[PDB]
């Protein structure tokens, strides 16, 4: 699939780039291609809950 | 002298941000003072009914 | 070394006495009092953008102008042929409650009701007519007349 | 102020 | 709706 | 209205005496003002040409 | 850390 | 029994008001078009 | 926690 | 019939605009077309009620 | 059917987007093609009750 | 009429 | 939730 | 909860 | 203030 | 004659 | 609501 | 409920 | 102070 | 002040 | 039983500065282009 | 139970100015191009 | 040991 | 040095 | 997460 | 304060 990571997050929006080069905002509750759902968005440590288990990181080469 | 204020209500002190003392004697006016003097209520008053 | 920690347990008490959740909190609170404040009460005026003939003929009532508190309202002059006919002038009735704003050129007169419910009236001298044309302004209605084209009765400069 | 930060 | 800066574990 | 002559006539006289000594006192300020800013005007820049 | 985050935020859902 | 004064001095002050911001009329407006 | 209704809702105890 | 709908109004004077493009005023005692007479006007509503029953409202439109 | 979603929201009127690019604006009662009536406007959520059930929210990718 | 923000669950 | 705000709105209509 | 005629209404218990 | 507003 | 805004039901 | 304003006009224009 | 005149005539109660 | 906001 | 007013 | 006048005062030091602000229009501005 | 009216006291002056710095909007700029 | 959260974290007793 | 920053470390980390 | 600085042996 | 200085 499409591996998105975290550009840069606030409580409330997080703005995410994908390896295609697109770039998305979300909110606490937010539709992802792939992922399901947001679930929760923890700016404090750069990550965000999707439904489907999957974590949203900072890349790691940027983090 | 309330009179003599009240003939000049838009200067101070009746106003112009008036203190509220102020205030409040340019709105209240002057009872009569010889009426609410009487001894027979106050006597009545300060002796227990019984 | 006790008295070290206590005191600053103390300390992060006093210095910021407002814990993040107490700022937050406050955050919150401030938020919703001033949205609170800035909602308009019950619904607010319809934004609708009319069209009215304005007939000059005695007998014929004045052409009604809705307004709303600190809102720009914006009547264009148009003759019978639809071209526009610029305003050789105007006058406010009550311009305590009303302040209209209109380049010496154009044909539109901007308005705003500067108190909520007062009612007046207007006149405007044309160009090429005889008869002014007068509109009463009333704000605070159901809705704002956010934009009036007046199909006056005659023939502009522009036909 | 969580533990995986 | 979740500020975390409120947070406690 | 509680009022007479005598003062009246006399603060009357002690107001506008006060602000008689305002205006003759601004004219004698008006007087060098003027002068100084005719010293300053002489050396302002002026347009000769009526197009721009 | 998140359990909390999370628990808050369905009892902020829930109790309206 | 004083209440109705109190309110008396309060209720005139604001009557008052109202009745001078009643007999204010301003002057209308004329803007003579280039 | 607390949520923007201003109304403050929390978890008990919740560790990860 | 002609249905007529409000223009404006406040207590007293109330301006009405309808399907034929006329305009009027009304006041508490009028005869007003096909209505018959203004019984009242509610203005803090923006009603008509008039003697025929048949109630003048903003337009859906315009209110 | 035409799905219209929010565009903006206060307390009283709201401002809504068709699918066919519409926009209108509706207060507490009003008759919107479709879903009827409106029944309630929730402004901070961002929400519309209309009489038919259908929940008007704003737009996914506009939210 | 309503004036939500003056809202009490 | 929005049953709180629904019948606050009809108990002001049916109340003049 | 408050109307525009100045005159309260409010409900008395609803949760969603 | 009435309750048809 | 009637002031509605004066009205009380 | 407007039953008054029926009640209040026609206790008016009874009584001058 | 008053008119202009100066008297106050007002409706008992009348409820919609 | 709504709780589905 | 009279009642047909 | 001095709570409610104490609370009271409060509320008139708040809400006379509130009604003072919506009391408030200021007159808009037009701008005229070059 | 004087703890409680010399905290509230504290943080009354801080929630004033925390009120304050949420008030301010900085105006934008315009730098316009040679 | 202080982290970043604020919470004070220690280590008891270590040496090399 | 290392080996109380270590520990220190785990505590934290274990500790939310 | 670890300052050092703040480091007791 | 470490002692690997």
């Known amino acids: 699939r499409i591996i998105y990571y975290i550009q840069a997050v606030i409580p409330g929006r997080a703005w995410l780039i994908g390896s295609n080069g697109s770039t998305l905002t979300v909110r606490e509750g937010s539709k992802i291609p792939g992922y399901g759902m947001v679930k929760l968005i923890d700016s404090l440590q750069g990550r965000i809950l999707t439904s489907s288990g999957q974590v949203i990181k900072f890349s790691q080469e940027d983090s | 002298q309330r009179d ?47 | ?111 705003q009701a500067t108190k909520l419910y007062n009612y007046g009236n207007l006149a405007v001298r044309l160009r090429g007519l005889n008869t002014p044309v007068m509109l009463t302004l009333i704000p605070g209605q159901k809705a704002v007349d956010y934009r009036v084209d007046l199909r006056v009765q005659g023939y502009g400069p522009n036909a | 102020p969580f533990g995986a930060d | 709706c979740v500020s975390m800066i409120g947070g406690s574990r | 209205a509680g009022y007479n002559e005598v003062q009246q006539k006399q603060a009357a006289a002690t107001l506008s005496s006060y602000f008689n000594n305002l205006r003759v006192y601004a004219a004698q300020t008006s007087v060098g003002v003027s002068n100084l800013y005719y010293i300053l005007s002489k050396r302002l820049p002026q347009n000769m040409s009526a197009d721009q | 850390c998140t359990d909390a985050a999370l628990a808050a935020l369905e009892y902020h859902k829930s109790n309206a | 029994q004083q209440e109705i004064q109190q309110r008396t001095s309060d209720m005139l002050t604001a009557a008052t008001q109202l009745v001078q911001d009643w007999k204010q009329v301003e002057t209308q407006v004329y803007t003579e078009g280039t | 926690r607390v949520s923007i209704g201003g109304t403050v809702y929390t978890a008990k105890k919740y560790d990860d």
């Open chain 2, 4 to 50: 003599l204020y009240l003939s000049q209500s838009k200067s101070p002190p009746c106003g112009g941000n008036p203190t509220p003392e102020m205030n409040t004697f340019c709105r209240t006016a002057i009872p009569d003072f010889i009426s609410t003097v009487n001894f027979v209520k106050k006597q009545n008053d300060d002796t227990p009914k019984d």
């Open chain 3, 1 to 111: 070394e006790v008295i070290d920690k206590k005191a600053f347990k103390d300390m992060t008490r006093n210095l910021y006495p407002l814990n993040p959740e107490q700022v937050v909190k406050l955050k919150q609170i401030y938020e919703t009092s001033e949205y609170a404040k800035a909602a308009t009460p019950g619904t607010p005026p319809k934004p609708t953008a009319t069209s009215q003939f304005v007939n000059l003929s005695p007998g014929s009532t004045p052409p009604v102008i809705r307004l709303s508190q600190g809102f720009v309202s914006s009547l264009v002059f148009l003759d019978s042929t639809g071209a526009p006919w610029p305003i050789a002038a105007y006058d406010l009735g009550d311009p305590s409650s009303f302040n209209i704003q209109w380049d010496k050129t154009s044909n539109t007169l901007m308005i």
